[PDB]
Design an enzyme around this catalytic site. Structure first.
Site: not given
Ligand SMILES: CC(C)CCNC(=O)[C@@H](CC1CCCCC1)NC(=O)N[C@@H](CCCCN)C(=O)O
Ligand SMILES: [Zn+2]
Ligand SMILES: [Zn+2]
Ligand SMILES: [Zn+2]
Length: 305
Positions: A64-65, A67, A122, A140, A192-194, A266
């Protein structure tokens, strides 16, 4: 003008991947695994002293961009490996016995877009049919219970599964490399983060993995090692139980291929700065994560399969 304590653009990172390999030829070797949607090379670094029948660990950063701290950690891992080799007892043993496949930036097109047009980007930078909406979520786009509950069929959505599984060139180039080196890869780590989480399979469905007890205890001990430095609190457990349903993930796909040690890290923080973590926090986040990564590495060596 490269610096490990500062956020570097793709031009600076690309110039670093070439220079760090040239300065350390006996430890690092650089190769291009594929090309992005715009045409940028996906560079991969093999860290460690060469040898025969060596087991390996795969580590990617920047799926994800936005992060930015994830991209910064991959650079710090290489920094430690060249400075502490021959000076630190554990790092010397790790590089001699194992090979580290470090992918510093997976989504390059998205990372350039965060430096030029939109910092909060993202997904990737690919076109979609019947809409002006751009991008597909790489986390995804893997073939592990693809586009089910938790993934979106809408191209305008941040969690877009894509037209098909591995429709993105970035997703295929990563998956093809793992398939070509399956017999050697023993561990998969995705930076990744956060939120400060350590995630293991499964995320595509509400189900516990074969070695759930082992993965629970390993993440627990890795959390403790990170906390000894700055007291940073980290939570752990499987994807669907701790986080949410996130189908078609890189960590879930790697596990179904045979890699029984699959993790998603994360990084900092909990929500104060979020994706825009300051430059003054890079060395603190990188040093603590190193302790957690070194512990996972030490365990894999003692439990080779
Ligand atoms: C707004 C909504 C659409 C969620 C988007 N998620 C994200 O931007 C990030 C960081 C974070 C954002 C604020 C809530 C907690 C997660 N989380 C993230 O990238 N999580 C991973 C989870 C990894 C699970 C292992 N495959 C993902 O979704 O790919
Ligand atoms: Zn991520
Ligand atoms: Zn250090
Ligand atoms: Zn044991």
């Amino acid at each position: 003008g490269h610096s490990y304590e500062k956020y570097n653009n793709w031009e600076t990172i690309e110039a670093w991947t070439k220079q760090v390999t040239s300065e350390n030829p006996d430890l690092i070797s650089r190769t291009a695994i594929g090309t992005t949607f715009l045409g940028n090379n996906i560079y991969l670094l093999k860290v460690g002293k060469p040898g025969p029948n060596k087991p390996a660990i795969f580590m990617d950063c920047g799926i994800h961009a936005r992060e930015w701290i994830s991209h910064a950690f991959c650079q710090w891992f290489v920094r430690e490996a060249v400075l502490t080799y021959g000076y630190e007892s554990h790092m010397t043993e790790f590089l001699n016995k194992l090979d580290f496949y470090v992918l510093p930036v997976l989504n390059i097109d998205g990372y350039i877009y965060t430096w030029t047009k939109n910092r909060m980007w993202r997904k990737t930078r690919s076109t979609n049919a019947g809409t002006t909406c751009i991008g597909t979520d790489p986390n995804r786009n893997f073939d592990a219970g693809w586009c089910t509950t938790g993934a979106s069929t809408d191209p305008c959505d941040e969690t877009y599964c894509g037209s098909a599984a591995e429709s993105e060139k970035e997703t295929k180039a990563l998956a093809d490399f793992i398939r070509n080196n399956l017999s050697s890869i023993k561990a998969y780590l995705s930076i990744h983060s956060y939120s400060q989480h350590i995630v293991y399979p499964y995320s595509y469905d509400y189900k516990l993995p074969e070695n759930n007890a082992e993965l629970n205890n390993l993440a627990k001990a890795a959390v403790k090692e990170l906390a000894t430095l700055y007291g940073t609190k980290y939570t752990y457990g499987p994807g669907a139980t701790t986080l949410y349903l996130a189908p078609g993930g890189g960590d879930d796909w790697a596990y179904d291929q045979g890699i029984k040690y699959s993790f998603t890290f994360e990084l900092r923080d909990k929500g104060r700065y979020g994706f825009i973590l300051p430059e003054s926090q890079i060395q603190a986040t990188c040093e603590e994560t190193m302790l957690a990564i070194k512990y996972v590495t030490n365990y894999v060596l003692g439990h080779l399969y």
